Amino acid sequence: AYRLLNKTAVITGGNSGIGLATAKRFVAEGAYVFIVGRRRKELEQAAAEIGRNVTAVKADVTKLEDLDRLYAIVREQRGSIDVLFANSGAIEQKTLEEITPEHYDRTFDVNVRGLIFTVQKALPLLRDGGSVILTSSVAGVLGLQAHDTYSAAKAAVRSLARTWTTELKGRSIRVNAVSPGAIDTPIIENQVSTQEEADELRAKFAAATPLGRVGRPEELAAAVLFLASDDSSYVAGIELFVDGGLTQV
Amino acid sequence: AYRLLNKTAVITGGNSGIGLATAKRFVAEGAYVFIVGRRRKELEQAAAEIGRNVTAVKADVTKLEDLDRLYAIVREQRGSIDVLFANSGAIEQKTLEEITPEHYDRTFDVNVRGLIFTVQKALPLLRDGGSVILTSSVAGVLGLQAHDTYSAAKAAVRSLARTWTTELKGRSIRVNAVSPGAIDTPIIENQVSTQEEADELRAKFAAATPLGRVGRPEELAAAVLFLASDDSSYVAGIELFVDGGLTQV
Amino acid sequence: AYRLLNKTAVITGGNSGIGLATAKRFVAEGAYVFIVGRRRKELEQAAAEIGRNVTAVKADVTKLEDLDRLYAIVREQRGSIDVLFANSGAIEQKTLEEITPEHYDRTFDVNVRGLIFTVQKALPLLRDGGSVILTSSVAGVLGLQAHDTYSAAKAAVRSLARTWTTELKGRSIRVNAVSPGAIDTPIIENQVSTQEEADELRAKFAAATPLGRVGRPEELAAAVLFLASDDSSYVAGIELFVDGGLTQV
Amino acid sequence: AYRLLNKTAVITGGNSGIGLATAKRFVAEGAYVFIVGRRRKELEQAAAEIGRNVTAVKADVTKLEDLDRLYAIVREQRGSIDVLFANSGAIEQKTLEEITPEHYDRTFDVNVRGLIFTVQKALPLLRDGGSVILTSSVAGVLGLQAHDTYSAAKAAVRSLARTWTTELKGRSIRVNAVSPGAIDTPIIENQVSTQEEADELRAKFAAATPLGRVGRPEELAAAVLFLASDDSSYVAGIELFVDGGLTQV
Numbered sequence: 001a002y003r004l005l006n007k008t009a010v011i012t013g014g015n016s017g018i019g020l021a022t023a024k025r026f027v028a029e030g031a032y033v034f035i036v037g038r039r040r041k042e043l044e045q046a047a048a049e050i051g052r053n054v055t056a057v058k059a060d061v062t063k064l065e066d067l068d069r070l071y072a073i074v075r076e077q078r079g080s081i082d083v084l085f086a087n088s089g090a091i092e093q094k095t096l097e098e099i100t101p102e103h104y105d106r107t108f109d110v111n112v113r114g115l116i117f118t119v120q121k122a123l124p125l126l127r128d129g130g131s132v133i134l135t136s137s138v139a140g141v142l143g144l145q146a147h148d149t150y151s152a153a154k155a156a157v158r159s160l161a162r163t164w165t166t167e168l169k170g171r172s173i174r175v176n177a178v179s180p181g182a183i184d185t186p187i188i189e190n191q192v193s194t195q196e197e198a199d200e201l202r203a204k205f206a207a208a209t210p211l212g213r214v215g216r217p218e219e220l221a222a223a224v225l226f227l228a229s230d231d232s233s234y235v236a237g238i239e240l241f242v243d244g245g246l247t248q249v
Numbered sequence: 250a251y252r253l254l255n256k257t258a259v260i261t262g263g264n265s266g267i268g269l270a271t272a273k274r275f276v277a278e279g280a281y282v283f284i285v286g287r288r289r290k291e292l293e294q295a296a297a298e299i300g301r302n303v304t305a306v307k308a309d310v311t312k313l314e315d316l317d318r319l320y321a322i323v324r325e326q327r328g329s330i331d332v333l334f335a336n337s338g339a340i341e342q343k344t345l346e347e348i349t350p351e352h353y354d355r356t357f358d359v360n361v362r363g364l365i366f367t368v369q370k371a372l373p374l375l376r377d378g379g380s381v382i383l384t385s386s387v388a389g390v391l392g393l394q395a396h397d398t399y400s401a402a403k404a405a406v407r408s409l410a411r412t413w414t415t416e417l418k419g420r421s422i423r424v425n426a427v428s429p430g431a432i433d434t435p436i437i438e439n440q441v442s443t444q445e446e447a448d449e450l451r452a453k454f455a456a457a458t459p460l461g462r463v464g465r466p467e468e469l470a471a472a473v474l475f476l477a478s479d480d481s482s483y484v485a486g487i488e489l490f491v492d493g494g495l496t497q498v
Numbered sequence: 499a500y501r502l503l504n505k506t507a508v509i510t511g512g513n514s515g516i517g518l519a520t521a522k523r524f525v526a527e528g529a530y531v532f533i534v535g536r537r538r539k540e541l542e543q544a545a546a547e548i549g550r551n552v553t554a555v556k557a558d559v560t561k562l563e564d565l566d567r568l569y570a571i572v573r574e575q576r577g578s579i580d581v582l583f584a585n586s587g588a589i590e591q592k593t594l595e596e597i598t599p600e601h602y603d604r605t606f607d608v609n610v611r612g613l614i615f616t617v618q619k620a621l622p623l624l625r626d627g628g629s630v631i632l633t634s635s636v637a638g639v640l641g642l643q644a645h646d647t648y649s650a651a652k653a654a655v656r657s658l659a660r661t662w663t664t665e666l667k668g669r670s671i672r673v674n675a676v677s678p679g680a681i682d683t684p685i686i687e688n689q690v691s692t693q694e695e696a697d698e699l700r701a702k703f704a705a706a707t708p709l710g711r712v713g714r715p716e717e718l719a720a721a722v723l724f725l726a727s728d729d730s731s732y733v734a735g736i737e738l739f740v741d742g743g744l745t746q747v
Numbered sequence: 748a749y750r751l752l753n754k755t756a757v758i759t760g761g762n763s764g765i766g767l768a769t770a771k772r773f774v775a776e777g778a779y780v781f782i783v784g785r786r787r788k789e790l791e792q793a794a795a796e797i798g799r800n801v802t803a804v805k806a807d808v809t810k811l812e813d814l815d816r817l818y819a820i821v822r823e824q825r826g827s828i829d830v831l832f833a834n835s836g837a838i839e840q841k842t843l844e845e846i847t848p849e850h851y852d853r854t855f856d857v858n859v860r861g862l863i864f865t866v867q868k869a870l871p872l873l874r875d876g877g878s879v880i881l882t883s884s885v886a887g888v889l890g891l892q893a894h895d896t897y898s899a900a901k902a903a904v905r906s907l908a909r910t911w912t913t914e915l916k917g918r919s920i921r922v923n924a925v926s927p928g929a930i931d932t933p934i935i936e937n938q939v940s941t942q943e944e945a946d947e948l949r950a951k952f953a954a955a956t957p958l959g960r961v962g963r964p965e966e967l968a969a970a971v972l973f974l975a976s977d978d979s980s981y982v983a984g985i986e987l988f989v990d991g992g993l994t995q996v
């Protein structure tokens with residue numbers, strides 16, 4: 001029943017939405033889970049909700065010293081990593097005209113830079129035969145109004161799964177990108193200015209998607225679990241689109 | 250523990266290699282499995298190996314009347330289909346110069362035509378919310394010497410998963426393509442002329458593949474299971490490469 | 499001024515739409531053009547419109563003996579081929595449910611089978627350093643209602659350009675796929691039942707396309723010219739989307 | 748004969764390799780060309796080699812004020828821009844383990860950040876109906892050892908062509924990515940430590956490429972010309988692989 005029995009997993013962006021739903025599923029499948037994020041309140045709540053086999057770690061992935069501290073804790077508590085889900089990321093809508101340097105840096109620091117260092121500093125603790133999952137996005141293959149940096153960053157993240165497949169093959173570490181479409185999580189709500197707008201952005205995505213609905217966080221976690229588990233043992237360097245068909249038709 | 254409990258599945262090409270390994274895994278996960286193929290001896294042996302919850306059906310997918318008969322049996326015995334794995338297919342190496350009309354028809358009849366009618370005639374029995382998996386190939390995105398028709402046919406198969414995602418969305422039926430790389434199955438042995446050559450074709454593919462090895466049939470089955478199961482509930486119309494990174498780097 | 503000066507070109511599907519516009523542009527660029535098709539009236543009109551350096555040849559690409567005859571004529575008149583544009587193809591809308599064997603064979607015979615033999619029988623006459631262009635379609639990467647066989651066939655055509663890039667590299671022959679989106683040609687009109695419907699199918703495609711308009715045949719020809727010319731001398735095995743951004747965003 | 752007659756074009760990275768070969772070809776086709784780069788010596792030499800209708804501008808794309816100055820000059824001298832070729836970029840080889848923050852910022856500043864602001868600040872001067880060409884790379888779809896940031900940056904650049912296809916469609920400005928493979932330019936020599944190594948890195952790429960050779964800068968320029976010209980008037984948001992078939996087979 002337990003497809004991740006006694007495996008140790010680290011999930012950045014674990015106190016919310018996709019990160020948290022995956023943490024739950026992971027624990028359900030008998031893993032020990034480190035959830036990682038900046039907000040202490042939410043971390044504590046997420047850990048409470050998860051219930052068992054979980055450690056909350058406060059860290060900002062754009063801060064190298066926070067990562068070092070993270071992996072020290074990981075090392076003390078469990079000693080090695082079987083599954084790394086480099087999932088923390090963020091979107092701010094700006095069109096080409098509106099792009100400032102600060103906006104650019106905010107996007108690329110958390111989505112690309114933070115992720116690069118998240119994976120680099122996990123390397124000493126990563127088990128041979130382990131599995132790294134990167135959270136790209138359908139944005140990374142689409143041309144969406146005012147998504148200039150987000151989309152570019154996530155296209156960067158998909159590339160890294162290809163490169164790290166070659167760089168880590170010697171250790172039999174599998175690296176795969178998951179690209180979600182519309183998933184019912186705080187990232188949608190936190191970008192609109194009004195709760196009215198959010199009802200409409202969701203109905204818009206549903207119309208565009210063959211399966212006629214936004215995805216549930218549970219469903220992204222299940223896709224990530226596949227990549228985390230032995231089931232994907234011959235799956236390497238891919239972009240797994242979990243978007244109800246959005247980019248496929 | 251049982252991710253396909255009481256679900257009814259039909260697998261063309263089920264007496265051998267990938268089809269059979271999937272049948273096993275399916276039954277292990279509590280499904281009832283129809284295995285389908287031409288050779289009666291092997292069908293009976295496969296059913297024996299599988300052991301429980303299995304029905305062998307003799308059918309040639311290029312023969313419409315065989316398909317009608319298949320689905321009559323399916324209907325009588327179980328009534329409906331939750332998972333269809335349209336997997337039967339075959340390869341014959343010929344270069345552009347060498348291509349005869351007979352060769353062309355042999356490839357396209359089993360790989361494309363047979364498959365089309367396999368799925369068409371399953372539609373009445375297919376459950377709403379069900380899952381169809383088509384077996385494409387890495388050939389469908391590569392330019393491999395003397396693979397002219399095979400590769401084209403399998404690229405045709407990947408396309409059908411996109412089209413049928415749109416045509417079946419109303420019934421919430423998910424259709425996905427699985428594209429295997431080198432997998433340790435009879436299809437490799439049955440195309441060479443000598444047992445010596447086969448040792449070398451396997452070592453060649455291993456060198457080309459980041460994971461440094463041919464895949465085990467068990468591993469393709471696990472990938473197919475993902476697509477068959479609820480875990481992929483928000484995965485539609487995709488090409489899942491199970492090739493150890495071959496086409497990804 | 500003349501980018502195809504004294505080069506000999508063969509264009510199947512040359513009496514209409516894309517084939518003809520390319521023939522014009524080719525002759526404008528100083529090529530000698532064979533146009534090829536079934537309808538004698540239209541062939542003669544097309545040759546008239548083109549004006550100079552053109553030979554019309556009646557042939558059905560699904561008939562091997564018509565191809566042999568074609569290449570006999572080609573050989574007698576000009577002796578060799580610098581540019582082959584395997585362009586003849588046809589669409590009939592039918593959903594999965596509606597698919598008959600006759601429909602299937604009609605689509606695959608002209609779009610895939612005919613094309614394969616078109617290119618195979620050109621090989622003896624094809625110049626080293628020559629250029630073959632296959633006409634795929636945006637359909638080959640999309641999931642369009644009732645396009646089941648068309649789309650699959652054109653996805654097959656794209657594959658062949660990859661395979662033939664490998665098989666013909668020894669002779670330095672470049673093979674590339676051109677995939678058009680909506681282009682203002684008879685293929686749109688000939689599939690609807692009413693002239694009213696055609697006004698609406700065109701306005702629908704325009705809305706879906708970033709450039710906000712259907713393409714002019716002149717524009718597909720220019721894209722084909724690029725692939726035919728020395729400009730694309732380091733371009734091999736590609737899918738050149740001429741669709742105003744349809745499949746790219 | 749003159750495909751870019753009286754059109755004004757701006758080429759970042761124009762004193763060297765691809766930038767310069769494209770500048771030459773552009774002028775040959777009757778354009779007026781701004782070449783842009785950091786090194787004053789080379790700029791002056793490039794302008795000398797080009798001969799006519801050229802203005803050299805010293806600018807560092809990572810420096811906003813340099814760009815502002817560049818576009819002031821452009822505006823005073825020629826007023827508007829018909830063709831922007833955002834081409835400046837740079838590679839430094841480092842594996843995941845080896846990645847420092849400085850290395851990361853060097854790559855992403857020139858390859859991604861600089862390019863974003865290059866295109867943003869051209870917008871006021873860009874003509875309706877104009878053409879923007881971004882230089883991605885085959886690296887953006889491959890997993891190459893120690894190409895971690897380069898490949899991710901270039902994958903970011905391809906994304907930008909998608910997003911800007913949508914954002915600029917209103918003004919009928921076409922944005923396309925060109926992704927070169929191995930091209931015979933200083934970027935190959937400037938990354939090795941020894942002139943011996945460079946003979947071997949070139950023979951390695953030649954073996955991997957169907958056309959059996961590295962590309963000439965002249966050949967990338969011809970491909971860029973196609974994108975710059977009216978020939979590609981219905982080609983938007985694409986990735987044009989100019990790699991002799993490297994990524995296509």
Ligand SMILES: NC(=O)c1ccc[n+]([C@@H]2O[C@H](COP(=O)([O-])OP(=O)(O)OC[C@H]3O[C@@H](n4cnc5c(N)ncnc54)[C@H](OP(=O)(O)O)[C@@H]3O)[C@@H](O)[C@H]2O)c1
Pocket residue numbers: 012013014015016017018019036037038039040042059060061062087088089090091110114135136137138139180181182183184185186187188
């Ligand atoms: N949901 C969708 O439909 C969708 C679609 C496309 C892509 N995605 C991708 O999914 C990922 C997140 O999934 P989501 O939608 O669940 O987003 P979400 O609901 O907003 O969750 C994002 C998580 O990332 C964390 N985070 C942000 N910056 C961080 C930093 N510097 N250090 C550590 N943690 C950081 C947040 O934790 P703190 O708040 O505590 O920092 C939060 O827990 C993002 O990469 C996003 O691009 C989601």
Ligand SMILES: NC(=O)c1ccc[n+]([C@@H]2O[C@H](COP(=O)([O-])OP(=O)(O)OC[C@H]3O[C@@H](n4cnc5c(N)ncnc54)[C@H](OP(=O)(O)O)[C@@H]3O)[C@@H](O)[C@H]2O)c1
Pocket residue numbers: 261262263264265266267268269285286287288291308309310311336337338339340359363384385386387388429430431432433434435436437439
């Ligand atoms: N393993 C790899 O390296 C690889 C690579 C690329 C693609 N693939 C694809 O994976 C799929 C499965 O292959 P496999 O590993 O199971 O190898 P296989 O056993 O050699 O392939 C044939 C399987 O389907 C059955 N079959 C063939 N034609 C049929 C027809 N007309 N009607 C009914 N059944 C038919 C075969 O035997 P019966 O005649 O007894 O039914 C057998 O069960 C194939 O479609 C293949 O193209 C495999």
Ligand SMILES: NC(=O)c1ccc[n+]([C@@H]2O[C@H](COP(=O)([O-])OP(=O)(O)OC[C@H]3O[C@@H](n4cnc5c(N)ncnc54)[C@H](OP(=O)(O)O)[C@@H]3O)[C@@H](O)[C@H]2O)c1
Pocket residue numbers: 510511512513514515516517534535536537538540557558559560585586587588589608612633634635636678679680681682683684685686688
């Ligand atoms: N323009 C678009 O919207 C669009 C979109 C996607 C793909 N395409 C592709 O573009 C290509 C040309 O389409 P089009 O716009 O030119 O359509 P069209 O105006 O209908 O012309 C199709 C051409 O193919 C020829 N043809 C058909 N069957 C043939 C056979 N057995 N032997 C020889 N010639 C045959 C026709 O000549 P006869 O009738 O005299 O034989 C005709 O000249 C096709 O391959 C099509 O699939 C076009």
Ligand SMILES: NC(=O)c1ccc[n+]([C@@H]2O[C@H](COP(=O)([O-])OP(=O)(O)OC[C@H]3O[C@@H](n4cnc5c(N)ncnc54)[C@H](OP(=O)(O)O)[C@@H]3O)[C@@H](O)[C@H]2O)c1
Pocket residue numbers: 759760761762763764765766767783784785786789806807808809834835836837838857861882883884885886927928929930931932933934935937
């Ligand atoms: N040739 C290939 O095999 C290949 C393969 C993949 C991609 N590419 C891409 O093709 C593009 C052109 O490369 P190339 O072959 O011509 O190589 P190159 O000879 O190194 O040229 C790179 C150009 O970028 C300019 N540049 C670099 N940093 C800059 C900055 N901060 N500000 C302004 N200009 C800057 C350089 O001028 P200064 O240094 O004088 O400023 C130089 O002219 C590059 O982006 C490269 O990524 C080439």
